[PDB]
Amino acid sequence: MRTRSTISTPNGITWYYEQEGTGPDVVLVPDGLGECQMFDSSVSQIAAQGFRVTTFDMPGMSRSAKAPPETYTEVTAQKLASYVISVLDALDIKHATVWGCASGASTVVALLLGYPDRIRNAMCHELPTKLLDHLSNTAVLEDEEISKILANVMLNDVSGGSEAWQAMGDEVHARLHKNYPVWARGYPRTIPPSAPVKDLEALRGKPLDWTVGAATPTESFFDNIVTATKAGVNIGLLPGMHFPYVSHPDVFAKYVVETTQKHL
Amino acid sequence: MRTRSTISTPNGITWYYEQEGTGPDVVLVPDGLGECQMFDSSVSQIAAQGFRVTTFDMPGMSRSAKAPPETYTEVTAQKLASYVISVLDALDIKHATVWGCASGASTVVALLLGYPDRIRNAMCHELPTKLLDHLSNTAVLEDEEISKILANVMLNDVSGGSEAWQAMGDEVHARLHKNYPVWARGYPRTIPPSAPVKDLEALRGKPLDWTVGAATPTESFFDNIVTATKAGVNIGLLPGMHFPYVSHPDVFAKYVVETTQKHL
Ligand SMILES: C[C@H]1CCCC(=O)CCC/C=C/c2cc(O)cc(O)c2C(=O)O1
Ligand SMILES: C[C@H]1CCCC(=O)CCC/C=C/c2cc(O)cc(O)c2C(=O)O1
């Protein structure tokens, strides 16, 4: 049975969150769009293997929208790592395996380096380390223009799975619709510079499993592959692109379960 | 003024070849389809920076079809390298800069390791090191189905630019049509295990520049990025996919020129 509820943290945030299962903690951190319904299938499938899975909407996004402005403007990996630790504190999760894509990826690595005592192991997928102009320039349009542009980028360019992306349903797309402008304004200018991978030695011998999408163009995350190799970090591929928990839920869960078991 | 001629080597091959310019030798080795017209405008552009540029159809392909069966069956990088060195010998090219994509990449790296006195510097692009079943399963089909399958794969999947591909013209496309069957039977099963890149340390500190197509799916040549990094070899991107010299002649020619000038 899944817990769906909210919990507030001292930093001003009311987090919407979900929990299923018993066992060691696995925490699924959203990409920038902040929407945890994307993990819904996987939450069950990972739990069914003997884990306790927790996920949540990110500050300012979807049902965690009650939050002060600093938590969704000028966002950095260190801010987000701070927020996440706070919700693990409130939920009394002492030790956690963490997964994260994009700004979640930067976040999980930042958790790993910053809170080594809390983080049993981290999976990072497609960590953004470069300023992208076709993303930053979206922030100075109308909100409704940005929602139209980015709903299309997600759907046709980076879903990795158009049908699956669409099958998430109207409620999810209505929430994402409101997140697109918030994301555009708070994330793509400040997340890349914050990437905690500029120090290779801090990376080395850490329980970190990095992945990039099989179908993503080689240029988008080429730098991830070079970085993980220079630091001896395990680096591999998942099917799809930016959202393997959406396009390939079954392979995603198996991957989380199997990487988790390896570090238990 | 391009020389367009034929020269025979004592291993039984009559090569169709092209030469333009005056200056240090730059040799452009085709991909597995073996067709040198794909280089046409880059030949001119590179030579106009002070280089003699030579290129050639590969044995058993296009206008170099007059060759004994061993040169186009069970093909390996060591075999191709040995053929290329035989045509360089015939053209009295003693010290060459070499470009190669795909099996041509395997070949240029095999050239660099095997003939360091002969090779000023080597540029390899998208070097195949993995068995791919869909390529391999085409050998068993009838010539015409192989041509249909592979013509489509090149057009829609890996060209990096379908207009540029189509614009090669009917003559080129009719020589490729004959080459697909020859290529399917001779190359995909035996080229990858011959990849000369399993000895990382022999690549270390060599004059080698490796590239991958910016738009190629990350999975296709992820392994190239790993190997070059482990080995210290310069790795970067060219725009497009498997045929940068068709889809982006200008960036391609400038890249060959710059990289060559680095090694003079
Ligand atoms: C929202 C999602 C949309 C993905 C939209 C997209 O264009 C994929 C390109 C890869 C970059 C994603 C990204 C980059 C950043 O600097 C910060 C981020 O939070 C993201 C990110 O989360 O991407
Ligand atoms: C002909 C060209 C078609 C390119 C067709 C294509 O599917 C691109 C996939 C990358 C592999 C190319 C390749 C693989 C091998 O094992 C041997 C080869 O000679 C090639 C190669 O040359 O690819």
User: Per-residue DSSP letters for A142-168?
Assistant: -HHHHHHHHHHIIIIIISS-HHHHHTT
Helix (H) / strand (E) containing A95: none
Helix residue ranges, H only, B187-217: 200-203
Helices B103-114 and B77-91: crossing angle in degrees, nearest 10, is: 70
For residue B34 the two structure tokens come to: 């073996």
In this structure, is the dihedral angle defined by the CA atoms of residues B156, B161, B162 and B168, taken in order, positive or negative? Answer: negative
d(CA B15, CA B87): 8
d(CA B18, CA B53): 8
Residue closest to B127 by CA, chosen among B107, B111, B157, B155: B107
Q: What is the B188 CA–ligand 2 centroid distance (Å)?
A: 7
Rounded to 5°, angle at Cα A83 from A78 and A88: 125
CATH number, domain B1-264: 3.40.50.1820
A51: phi then psi, degrees, rounded to nearest 5: -125, 160
d(CA B215, CA B207): 25
- Alpha carbons within 13 A on the beta-carbon side of B79: 20
Q: How far from chain centre, in Å, is Cα B234?
A: 19
Helix (H) / strand (E) containing A17: strand A14-20
- Is there a contact between B86 and B60 (Cβ–Cβ < 8 Å)? no
Torsion angle of C-alpha atoms A105, A106, A110, A116, degrees rounded to 10: 20
Residue indicated by tokens 């207009």? B163
The burial of B245, by beta-carbon neighbours within 10 Å (0-12 exposed, 13-18 middle, 19 or more buried), is given as buried
User: What was the experiment behind these coordinates?
Assistant: X-ray
d(CA B107, CA B214): 22
Q: Does B216 touch chain A (CB under 8 A)?
A: yes
A2: phi then psi, degrees, rounded to nearest 5: -100, 135
Ligand 2 atom 11: the closest Cα is on which residue? B128
DSSP B137: T
**End-to-end alpha-carbon separation of chain B, Å?**
24
Q: Which ligand is nearest to the CA of A179?
A: 1
Indicate the residue of A217, A218, A229 with minimum beta-carbon distance to B226: A229
- Name the residue type at position A109: V
Helix (H) / strand (E) containing A22: none
CB atoms closer than 10 angstroms to residue B153: 16
Q: What is the A188 CA–ligand 1 centroid distance (Å)?
A: 7
Residue closest to A195 by CA, chosen among A59, A73, A78: A78
- Is there a contact between A231 and A224 (Cβ–Cβ < 8 Å)? no
Q: How far from chain centre, in Å, is Cα B61?
A: 13
The burial of B10, by beta-carbon neighbours within 10 Å (0-12 exposed, 13-18 middle, 19 or more buried), is given as exposed
Helix (H) / strand (E) containing A3: strand A3-8
Residue of B nearest to A218 (CA): B218
B4: phi then psi, degrees, rounded to nearest 5: -130, 100
For residue B255 the two structure tokens come to: 């890249």
For residue A34 the two structure tokens come to: 């902040």
For residue B250 the two structure tokens come to: 């200008």
Rounded to 5°, angle at Cα B131 from B127 and B137: 125
d(CA B187, CA B58): 12
**E strand intervals along chain B:** 3-9, 13-20, 25-29, 52-56, 96-101, 119-125, 208-213, 234-238
For residue B53 the two structure tokens come to: 């540029």
**End-to-end alpha-carbon separation of chain A, Å?**
24
Q: Which ligand is nearest to the CA of A29?
A: 1
DSSP B20-62: E-SSSEEEEE--TT--GGGGHHHHHHHHTTT-EEEEEPPTTSG
Resolution (A): 2.5
DSSP A70-81: GGTSS--HHHHH
Q: How far from chain centre, in Å, is Cα B263?
A: 20
The burial of A121, by beta-carbon neighbours within 10 Å (0-12 exposed, 13-18 middle, 19 or more buried), is given as buried
3-state secondary structure of B10: coil
Beta pairing class for A234-238 and A208-213:
parallel
In this structure, is the dihedral angle defined by the CA atoms of residues A85, A91, A95 and A101, taken in order, positive or negative? Answer: negative
Residue indicated by tokens 């099958």? A167
In this structure, is the dihedral angle defined by the CA atoms of residues A253, A256, A258 and A261, taken in order, positive or negative? Answer: negative
In this structure, is the dihedral angle defined by the CA atoms of residues A92, A96, A99 and A102, taken in order, positive or negative? Answer: positive
Residue indicated by tokens 């951190």? A29
Residue closest to B61 by CA, chosen among B21, B9, B17: B17
Q: Are the Cβ atoms of A216 and B221 closer than 8 angstroms?
A: no
A interface test, pick of B225, B233, B237, B242 with most A CB neighbours within 10 Å:
B225
Residue closest to B53 by CA, chosen among B264, B260, B263: B260
Rounded to 5°, angle at Cα A40 from A38 and A41: 110
CB atoms closer than 10 angstroms to residue A78: 16
Q: What is the A175 CA–ligand 1 centroid distance (Å)?
A: 17
d(CA B21, CA A85): 65
Question: With a 6 A CB cut-off, is B34 part of the ligand 2 pocket?
Answer: no
What is the per-residue burial (b if ≥16 Cβ within 10 Å, else e) of B166-185?
Answer: eebeeebeebbbebbbbbbb
Residue of B nearest to A234 (CA): B226
- Is there a contact between A205 and A234 (Cβ–Cβ < 8 Å)? no
Question: With a 6 A CB cut-off, is B183 part of the ligand 2 pocket?
Answer: yes
Q: Does B135 touch chain A (CB under 8 A)?
A: no
> Which residues partner with B19 through β-bridges?
B3, B54
The burial of B72, by beta-carbon neighbours within 10 Å (0-12 exposed, 13-18 middle, 19 or more buried), is given as buried
d(CA A108, CA A101): 9
B140: phi then psi, degrees, rounded to nearest 5: -70, -10
Q: Which residues in chain B have Cβ-Cβ distances shorter than 8 Å to A220?
A: 218
Q: What is the A105 CA–ligand 2 centroid distance (Å)?
A: 33
Which residues, other chains included, contact A233 with Cβ-Cβ below 8 Å and sequence gap of 6+? A203, A204, A206, A208, A209, A210, A227
In this structure, is the dihedral angle defined by the CA atoms of residues B228, B257, B92 and B103, taken in order, positive or negative? Answer: positive
